[PDB]
């Protein structure tokens, strides 16, 4: 029992949150946990709000989980999403680079092309691909935003500072950090490619399948593999940039209500998980894709006691993030 203040980013998430609140009220008893919705403009405002005791929980992509851990925020991961199936849950996913068929360029020929990113600092959309191109970037590589802006001939990198790095919002003027920007996130980054604004979209292996139902529409796209070849989109297991940890819900280190968070989500998945209810779905919405949780998730797993972001993310991934930040070639 008691209320978990979920931090919703912008209108669409806010709408799904309110429906989430209402549906749980109808199934949960008076003595069960409940949801209240707190709307903010960006994930970064949700991170501050939780630290300031204005909200309690928010789901973040793993690259943002690192930032949330840093002082003075010190949030910790408490519940993880899992993908795949309930039968063989995967606590990771694949970062891929999607391009259109016959566009004629490999991964070593990206300079001067136009890029669509899910958002600044996110695993698949940013950390992995920029991490892989880092030394191909021209000096000076600090700040990163500027070297990236000079390598591609225009991008959409949501959450980046368009005032300071205008080329980063060339494909999505303003670099809006929420679903109000139609090119934000996995599906937004894919739309940026499909619409012809960009030449490459840095997304996850499931993105295209979530967006194109026909195999014949999907045959018009391919993946860039690290060996400078291209493969079809079904072949992501042998043509991907990296494997990355799942998105996770974070909470405060003190008075964080981690117990209630797990309690609420565990019940939520039981009533409203994949194919559970005709009334409401935790992992999909008529209002948008990946709102509050990713549409590709199949459920949740509780993170082990007192695990910090660094341990959760793993040495490798943490090393990569660090090396992007200072990083020496």
């Amino acid at each position: 029992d008691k209320t978990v203040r979920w931090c919703a980013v912008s209108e669409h998430e806010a709408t799904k949150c309110q429906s989430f609140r209402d549906h749980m009220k109808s199934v949960i008893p008076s003595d069960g946990p409940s949801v209240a919705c707190v709307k903010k403009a960006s994930y970064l405002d949700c991170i501050r709000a939780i630290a300031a005791n204005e909200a309690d929980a928010v789901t973040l992509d793993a690259g943002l989980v690192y930032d949330a851990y840093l002082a003075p925020n010190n949030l910790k991961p408490v519940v993880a999403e899992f993908y795949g199936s309930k039968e063989d849950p995967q606590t990771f996913y694949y970062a891929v680079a999607v391009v259109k068929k016959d566009s004629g360029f490999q991964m070593n020929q990206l300079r001067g092309k136009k890029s669509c990113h899910t958002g600044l600092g996110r695993s698949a959309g940013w950390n992995i691909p920029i991490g892989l191109l880092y030394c191909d970037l021209p000096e000076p590589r600090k700040p990163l935003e500027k070297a990236v802006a000079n390598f591609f001939s225009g991008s959409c990198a949501p959450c980046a500072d368009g005032t300071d790095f205008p080329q980063l919002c060339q494909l999505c003027p303003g670099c809006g950090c929420s679903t109000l920007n139609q090119y934000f996130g996995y599906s937004g980054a894919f739309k940026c490619l499909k619409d012809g604004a960009g030449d490459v979209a840095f997304v996850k292996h499931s993105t295209i399948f979530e967006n194109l139902a026909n195999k014949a529409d999907r045959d018009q796209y391919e993946l860039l593999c690290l060996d400078n070849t291209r493969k079809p989109v079904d072949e992501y297991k042998d043509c991907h940039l990296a494997q990355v940890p799942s998105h996770t819900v974070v909470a405060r280190s003190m008075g964080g209500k981690e117990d209630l968070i797990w309690e609420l989500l565990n019940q939520a998945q039981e009533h409203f998980g994949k194919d559970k209810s005709k009334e409401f779905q935790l992992f999909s919405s008529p209002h948008g894709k990946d709102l509050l949780f990713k549409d590709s998730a199949h459920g949740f797993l509780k993170v082990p006691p007192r695990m910090d972001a660094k341990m959760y993310l793993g040495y490798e991934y943490v090393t990569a993030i660090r090396n992007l930040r200072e990083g020496t070639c």
């Binding site: 341990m311 793993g314 040495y315």
Partner: protein, 345 residues
């Protein structure tokens, strides 16, 4: 890293607690900075430092070598205890026994439930993995702190039964700041408060007959102790060979793949001037000699020997040991191991 050469300037060693640090410093000065010292308060923290290049190398008991391997480190050189000929292959391992007081007439292998136990530390081979896994296969649950009535198994939860016998300033720490920590600490624990100690076979001898001059052990006699045999009987300590729990892979030095070679070579070299050969250890520096007990290396360490192809933790520890530690996986409480096993590649 344009066409470059030579990162092997100096090897940074990770040391637990105060004492190991002192010994390391001493080893630093004398080498002329070939050995550099980093410190931490726990074995797991030391492994973490090495994982993320805050340090390069440390020596470890087999049980911790397992964790280190799951965390991506590799064994480089093994500690050999049986011979002074450092070109010998690594031994098959040391004997792991259970020791009791002759005074105590009733205790036996099939009788442990209820008694008071003493362990080198949680996660070590002779102190935990061997004995706990063999008991586990009997009680088929993991509340070892409910099987024994009370104990001192350093590295356990500050408020379980298994920390109730500990003493060292830092109560129950997995390091030297706990008195009953290690092969020796567990023996003393036996001498002073426990009914059973899980340690290596050479432990009784190294601490009886005035060979150990601390007040608690100066007058102790090898004849005052027995071993528990798996078949329920008891035997004198001189009989480990026919009355031990299992064999335990020797402690081994670990590093990261990137630096394994560097580490090797500098150790093999340093051994030439600081190993068994040193006739007097109070005059010149000795790696395998410790002011206290077992700092950085086991004091009974004779040689650091090349692994001859067993350059992998599964390869070095061996199947049997792996199979045994795995069976105990479900009782782990190692925060570093869960960390190292999170990523799905």
């Amino acid at each position: 890293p344009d066409p470059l050469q030579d990162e092997c300037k100096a090897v940074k060693w990770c040391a637990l607690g105060h004492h190991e640090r002192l010994k390391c410093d001493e080893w630093s000065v004398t080498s002329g900075g070939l050995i550099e010292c980093e410190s931490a308060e726990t074995p797991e923290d030391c492994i973490a430092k090495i994982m993320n290049g805050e340090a390069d190398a440390m020596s470890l008991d087999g049980g911790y070598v397992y964790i280190a391997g799951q965390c991506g480190l590799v064994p480089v050189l093994a500690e050999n205890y049986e011979s002074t000929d450092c070109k010998k292959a690594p031994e098959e391992g040391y004997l792991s026994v259970a020791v009791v007081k002759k005074s105590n007439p009733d205790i036996n292998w099939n009788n442990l439930e209820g008694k008071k136990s003493c362990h080198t530390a949680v996660d070590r081979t002779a102190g935990w993995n061997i004995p706990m896994g063999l008991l586990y296969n009997r009680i088929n649950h993991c509340r070892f702190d409910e099987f024994f009535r009370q104990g001192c198994a350093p590295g356990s939860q500050k408020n379980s039964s298994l920390c109730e016998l500990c003493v060292g300033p830092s109560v129950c720490a997995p390091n030297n700041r706990e008195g009953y920590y290690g092969y020796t600490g567990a023996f003393r624990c036996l001498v002073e408060k426990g009914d059973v100690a899980f340690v290596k076979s050479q432990t009784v001898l190294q601490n009886t007959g005035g060979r150990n001059s601390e007040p608690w052990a100066k007058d102790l006699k090898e004849e005052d102790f027995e071993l528990l045999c798996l078949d329920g009987t008891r035997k004198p300590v001189s009989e480990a060979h026919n009355c031990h729990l299992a064999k335990a892979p020797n402690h081994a030095v670990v590093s990261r793949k990137d630096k394994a070679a560097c580490v090797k070579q500098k150790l093999l070299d340093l051994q030439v001037e600081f190993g068994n050969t040193v006739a007097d250890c109070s005059s010149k520096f000795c790696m395998f000699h410790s002011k206290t007990k077992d700092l950085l290396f086991r004091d009974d360490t004779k040689c650091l020997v090349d692994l001859r192809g067993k350059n992998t933790y599964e390869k070095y520890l061996g199947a049997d040991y792996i199979k045994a530690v795995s069976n105990l996986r479900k009782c782990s409480t190692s925060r570093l191991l869960e960390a190292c096993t999170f990523h799905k590649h």
